[PDB]
Symmetry: none
Subunit: 64 residues, 3 copies
């Protein structure tokens, strides 16, 4: 129920808009992910993982 | 040119040479040739490298 | 590709031969760059930037 997207953006020198444009999503979608308002679709989680060279479980943590 | 920060930037960005090559749609030997200065990049490729790292071209390459 | 070399020549009242002489390239090389005929090597882009006192990104435009 949380993620490391904000921290990873800083590590990769990306603004929210930069990350959004690289994933073909809007800047608001990126901000919604970082604040947890929107849970990503699985395809968007995959796109994030490949962009950062990580597995989904490296970026997103969830309960269950 | 031999003087460039591609290797250092790769380490900062969690990239192997092959990872960087795939992100730029070039081959792995092209990346190695760029880092060692054996190849000078085309201007379009220099732009793609600069935009990937969010930097100016002059931040990555020295003339 | 796309660049402002021709606009910069006009702003500084330079002929193609003037710019060629200042950069040690041929006049045909200058014309190919201004018309978008040739994409320059990075060393040539630097020399253009240094001559005009500008950044590479100030002179050249690229789709990525």
């Amino acid at each position: 129920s949380k993620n490391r997207i904000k921290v990873l953006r800083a590590e990769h020198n990306l603004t929210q808009a930069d990350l959004a444009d690289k994933l073909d999503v809007s800047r608001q979608t990126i901000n919604a992910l970082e604040t947890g308002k929107y849970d990503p679709s699985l395809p968007l989680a995959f796109k994030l993982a490949r962009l950062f060279g990580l597995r989904i479980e490296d970026i997103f943590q969830d309960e269950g």
